Design a protein around this ligand. Structure first.
Ligand SMILES: CO[C@H]1O[C@H](CO)[C@@H](O)[C@H](O)[C@@H]1S[C@H]1O[C@H](CO)[C@@H](O)[C@H](O)[C@@H]1O
Ligand SMILES: [Ca+2]
Ligand SMILES: [Ca+2]
Ligand code: NA
Length: 434
């Protein structure tokens, strides 16, 4: 019997609404729900929540036609959400989750207050860039005072701003946001080695690399996405060039096969010698990026490595040893990168194979992570049943439920040909208002 995709989309929507009801009941205005205990936790600043999961959920709610829920969230933001807070926030997370979540909600609704708040927050983050003579942001900034801390940063945390900041520039008319984000990326690209790689670790004050490890994985990953995404969103010719150059250097020097499967271990950024044996689950994003930049066959080959992990382990292990293809960790973060890749590859030619693979992933989420008041990260994927931890990460609200729904629903609320997603799955182009 063929899959009824519209029925599966309706199930995703029903589950998302049910989870939202749990958030309203147990964690209203709080950063994250802990859906096993039915409690909440803070994310950015302990004891000073910023409605994180509410903000992350907004564009998903709108796309699903959960309009009353969307409006309840928007109305909470407009009455309550302030960033004039004497506490330290991690610049990268604050941008991709809160700036991006407010921007997607603004684009869906047209509500100027959501743009005002996104821009206020971006101006607070700008102080972290201004505190470096290179324009490389410090990792943490005090939202009220502008004081910075921790300049020992990385490509992801200096280079995952251009989509949100560039959209701010388009909407506001002020080019400063785009320019600030692009300058930080150019800095590290100008320090590529002769083999075209950057080390992942960079110092905001010296402007120098602080390791020799090139990576496609955690601490690097979304830099490479945002090069392509800036071409797609803004027509930026430098970023188009840089995206393809970086990926082809990675394919030349980091693509390695182990037991017949493609992986991308870390390598010395100058010599290409392999310097690690781990790959995280989060690297699955790269299968989709490979397709986006015109390397679809290679993207499908990399997706197949993660499809192997899903078929073998049920849930993709949080980290594996590439030399054995086995888990290095037993816990998970309820991670979204596999359906991320499936959606991105599916947007190319609508191949039903990607729907089939994402349906496995959704059903496995239901079979493993469902708790009393929502969906939770896992303690141990090796027990039967898999044991649960007690946390719904904020990204769940923006990412995998949206990915599943976009893959299955063919919703008229999205122009699929114009759809653009941030690394947190915030929709930055493609809304079709009702
Ligand atoms: C620790 O891993 C996170 O942060 C580093 C930067 O410190 C990133 O390089 C890494 O990709 C993730 S954030 C990444 O994954 C999340 C979902 O698993 C989500 O916030 C979003 O997809 C983000 O791109
Ligand atoms: Ca991501
Ligand atoms: Ca992407
Ligand atoms: Na969102």
């Amino acid at each position: 019997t063929p899959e009824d995709w519209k029925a599966l989309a309706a199930d995703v929507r029903s589950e998302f609404q049910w989870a939202w009801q749990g958030y309203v009941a147990k964690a209203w205005g709080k950063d994250e729900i802990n859906p096993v205990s039915g409690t909440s936790r803070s994310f950015f600043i302990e004891g000073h929540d910023l409605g994180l999961s509410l903000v992350e959920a907004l564009d998903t709610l709108w796309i699903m036609g959960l309009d009353a829920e969307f409006q309840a969230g928007v109305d909470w933001v407009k009455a309550n959400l302030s960033f004039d807070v004497d506490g330290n926030a991690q610049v990268f997370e604050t941008n991709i989750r809160l700036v991006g979540g407010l921007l997607s909600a603004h684009l869906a609704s047209g509500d100027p207050v959501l743009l005002a708040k996104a821009r206020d927050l971006a101006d607070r983050l700008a102080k972290a860039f201004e505190a470096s003579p290179h324009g490389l942001p410090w990792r943490y900034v005090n939202l009220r005072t502008g004081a910075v801390s921790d300049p020992e940063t990385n490509l992801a945390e200096i280079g995952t701003y251009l989509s949100e900041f560039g959209v701010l520039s388009q909407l506001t008319g002020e080019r400063k946001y785009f320019d600030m984000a692009k300058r930080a990326m150019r800095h590290t690209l100008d320090r590529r080695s002769k083999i075209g790689l950057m080390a992942a670790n960079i110092h905001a004050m010296t402007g120098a690399f602080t390791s020799r490890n090139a990576s496609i994985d955690v601490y690097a990953d979304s830099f490479y996405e945002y090069l392509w995404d800036a071409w797609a969103l803004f027509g930026d010719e430098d970023c188009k060039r840089w995206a393809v150059e970086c990926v082809d250097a990675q394919l030349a020097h980091q693509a390695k096969r182990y037991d017949g499967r493609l992986w991308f271990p870390m390598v010395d950024f100058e010599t290409g010698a392999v310097t690690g044996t781990a790959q995280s689950e989060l690297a699955a994003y790269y299968a989709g990026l490979l397709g986006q930049v015109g390397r679809k066959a290679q993207g499908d080959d990399y997706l197949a490595s993660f499809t192997y992990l899903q078929a073998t382990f049920g849930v993709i292990p949080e980290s594996i040893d590439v030399t054995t293809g086995q888990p290095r960790r037993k816990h998970t973060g309820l991670r979204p990168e596999y359906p991320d890749a499936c959606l991105n590859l599916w947007l190319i030619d609508r191949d039903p194979r990607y729907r089939r693979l994402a349906a496995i992933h959704y059903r496995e989420m239901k079979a493993t992570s469902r708790a009393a008041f929502g969906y939770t990260a896992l303690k141990d994927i090796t027990t039967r049943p898999m044991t649960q931890d007690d946390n719904c990460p904020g990204y769940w609200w923006s990412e995998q439920m949206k990915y599943y729904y976009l893959l299955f629903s063919d919703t008229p609320r999205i122009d699929y040909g114009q759809l653009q997603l941030s690394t947190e799955a915030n929709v930055l182009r493609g809304f079709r208002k009702v």
